[PDB]
Amino acid sequence: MERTFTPNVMQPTPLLPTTNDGRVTFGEAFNDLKDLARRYQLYWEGTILEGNLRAIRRNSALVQLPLYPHGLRIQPDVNNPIWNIMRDGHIPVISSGFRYFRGGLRLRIVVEGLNSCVWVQHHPDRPSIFSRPIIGRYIAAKDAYRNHAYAAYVQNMSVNRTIEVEVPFYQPGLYGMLNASDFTGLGDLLIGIEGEQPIPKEGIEISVYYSIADDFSFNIFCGFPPMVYCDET
Amino acid sequence: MERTFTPNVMQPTPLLPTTNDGRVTFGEAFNDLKDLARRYQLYWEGTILEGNLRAIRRNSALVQLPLYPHGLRIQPDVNNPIWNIMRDGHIPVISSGFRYFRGGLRLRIVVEGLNSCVWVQHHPDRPSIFSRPIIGRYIAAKDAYRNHAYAAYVQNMSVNRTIEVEVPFYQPGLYGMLNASDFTGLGDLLIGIEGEQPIPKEGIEISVYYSIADDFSFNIFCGFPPMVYCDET
Amino acid sequence: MERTFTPNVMQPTPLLPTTNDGRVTFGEAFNDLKDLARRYQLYWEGTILEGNLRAIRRNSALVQLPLYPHGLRIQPDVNNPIWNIMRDGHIPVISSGFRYFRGGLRLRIVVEGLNSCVWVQHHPDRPSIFSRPIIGRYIAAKDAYRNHAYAAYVQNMSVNRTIEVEVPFYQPGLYGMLNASDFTGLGDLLIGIEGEQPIPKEGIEISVYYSIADDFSFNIFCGFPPMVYCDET
Amino acid sequence: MDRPEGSEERTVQTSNVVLGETNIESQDIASKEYSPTWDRLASSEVSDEYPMLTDRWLFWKSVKWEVNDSAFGKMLVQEKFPQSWVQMDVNVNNIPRYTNIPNFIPFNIHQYMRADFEVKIYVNPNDFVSGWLIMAFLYQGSEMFDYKLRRNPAALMQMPHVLVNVGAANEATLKIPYRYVRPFMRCKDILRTEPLNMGVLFVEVLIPFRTSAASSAPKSLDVSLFVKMTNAKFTGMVDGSIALLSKPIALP
Amino acid sequence: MDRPEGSEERTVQTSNVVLGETNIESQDIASKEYSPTWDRLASSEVSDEYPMLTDRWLFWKSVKWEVNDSAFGKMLVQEKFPQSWVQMDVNVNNIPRYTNIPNFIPFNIHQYMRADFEVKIYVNPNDFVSGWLIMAFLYQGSEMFDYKLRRNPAALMQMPHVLVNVGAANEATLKIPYRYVRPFMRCKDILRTEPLNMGVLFVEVLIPFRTSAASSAPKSLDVSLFVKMTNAKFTGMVDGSIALLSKPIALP
Structure with a gap:
């Protein structure tokens, strides 16, 4: 096989004795990228103001966020300097090397400001038109309010501030496509308020973090794209 | 062996009968300094004001605190009279007698004021330049915001005010050096807010307490340094 | 091995039937150069006059002759036309092909003229400065008379005219060097009169013949030097 | 050459085609080979399976590359695949047609298909020219959000590829197991996706082609490509004229 | 060349050095190999034996020989050996020093040594040049009363040698068992004999080197020499500075 082929090997010394992937000196074995990809990382972080929401703005969406196992497309503005100096996370970088996937994501949505009953809902097949989220008044007529019978979840920001949910993989096809260009992905995730708590005069600060589920798998290893060093920022 | 060598012992009486290290009269046995070193003690206690933080000051560091199993260098100012009249704790004093260590610390970070989602993160190899912490705007460009894929933790100060985490021992070398002078230590611990809750017009009062993990061990016993009696303050 | 290597041999006929190295047709087998080198050959032939001897010239050296298994250096003057038209013997020619040796020589010293008690003596380690012999008055202060306890031999030229002695191999080293340039060789051989018989008014005609002992061996075969045909004289 | 005819050539026969090869190949497999079950x-x-038709090897292109134009990473072949191979036969208007070539005759009457491919590349230089080519394949490469950064041969060295050394003048065989977002591909433009677009096949110029300064030496060299399908299964019989083909879109 | 990489090269590894060789060697042994007993x-x-240090191969010289200067029997290499190889590392004043090279580090602290050597010679011509070299070794040749008549290659054809055909471009290995007038050699100039003078290594030009009349053809060719010790035993530990080295004497 041409990728791993090694002709005429000239090796001066023996090979180095093994630590069982670090289990000898540390306690754990770092043998796999799928375990590194299950440590949570930031996904999208935004603010939402009154007045760029709906007119009536009782139980409505605040964000429809597209679920991609690679990241959303990043733009490194001056508001969140994360996306600027840290570039992408470890998950978009691991993901850019594989072609397909099959499996779900885990999310952690931390929506505060607001401190009322907030809700989340997964539309497994309404994909996949764009690489940004859509805020408030710009989400389309039929993604505006909650729907009936889509898998959803509800939480009082008074009891607890963090919603942690796991999105299933519901698709007709064999794979979902990593590195899509722009029914390929995991569909949409809608986040929204449950009935018109008055909004603080600055912001509802939402931030989504994500990871890989347990049954998730990266599937066909082609190359990595060209990278950019973070220390050059 | 010259350290314990006893030539020409003249002993007038028998030895005293044992209480099993106090287990006869109290209920417990105090036979070991490693158990005394696992009772928590104060590590660093400070205040942080708006205006000695960042310009944009959304999810940023508030402190980068260097993890040392001996203490940080103390300075006994009039603000916290602890460091003045109590001197160091029992852990910096136990630690000054040993040369190396291998193992982790446990921390308890009590960050309140603020009452929003706060976060902690361990940089196992970015050591070790100084014996003080670094507050706010003075932390360097690449330790400013959160990073991706470093072991981190998040907590709403609304649910609970105390973050208790355990820092692992990740180093290339054999030992870490107790009593370092100034990759020797446990790296850095970064503490930071998650997105620009308005800061009370006086202070975010952080205090870190620490202890030894279970797998931690002090390793080569040389002398103790010269001490100073606390009752002379 | 490159010296005897024979690639792509094309042989038209069978090999010739053997005579066992001549033992079939003559009576003896000439299979070896070491046997040819044990037939005596001339070594040095000279004359010695009164007046190029010592002043007092009682028991003194007449010649100190250096023992070399290759020959002495030859000079082909008109007195002995041997060295001129015959060149060297078979022994200097055999010897020039080998590098080392280990073993002794046999000599036959025929000293006549004089007809008195003559003597011979071997100095196993006083070597080896020159390729000629040294006659009479020119031999150095401490090689002048007989010495004590060096292996020596004595003979009346009245009883018999021929002294045949065998010189041992006494050296510290492993080998002696054939083809030396100028403790490498067999040392010196001193020949001398035993107490001032009046010398005939012309000459004491000495001639030494030599051979190889039984334990002698030629040791590392390198090339032969370039030769000169005798029939061109 | 030591015999009256030069030497013993080696023969690779499939269906009624027979391909001679004088050298040791250079092989690779684009992913793990399997047996389709969810299809x-x-x-x-x-x-329907047509082993006598589709298993047969087929000559695809000849691309010419010259000394004056060999950069590092000049693309000789950049094609949507199998789309370009199957739609290779065009009429006067450059509209493809599945009717002439007997390997492609079942693409005409069916709607969906599935199959594995093997691409084989041939370069016949003389002894005194030296160069080097890389032929790699990227599963559904055209749909990738950065498809035009992955064309550097430094990126192709990572995806499954073969190498053709022009000094040695070897063969090269790239097996491509069927993998896709759905268990079948469309054969024509239906239900208004392009037909039969499973990936992108590249041929780049890893080390530029060099010859001697002599005037009569060849300044050019040819590259030929043969392809064959393996487990080809067709489904959904319809009329040949019920759907249409439109002239293909090219890659940037 | 029939494979993607040219062919299978062959590897000769000793200590932490590994030497590739593509052809059949040409070997010879300067005398019978034995086990030292009277030492x-x-x-x-x-x-003391230092197998990790001394067994290792070592690059010695590169000598260049040109078309315009190849007589019959022009000497490329004429060296006192191992003296020239061991004293190869000179400072600004051409005074040798045993300190830098890790094979020669024990020569620094000892007085006497003993060991067998293997000299290996490498010539990398293209196919269209033809010549021929002979590399022979003469035990304690410099001390011989006619040392300067034995330099003709007609004399070297007799002492133990190897041949390097430039048309075939082979390797060559000359094993030299330790033989000397005493069971050890001196490492420095002591007790006032030159240090480590066991013989003379020659490289002559048996058939002169010839190329084509074309202007761009190579008019020159390189010869490289590797040496290694085998049963090396050192004795007589002293200070490194207790004895001195003086710049070597050259042969006529």
């Missing part, structure tokens, strides 16, 4: 879940009609 | 009679101190 039975997609279609209630029996999948 | 224990010479020294009451234990002989």
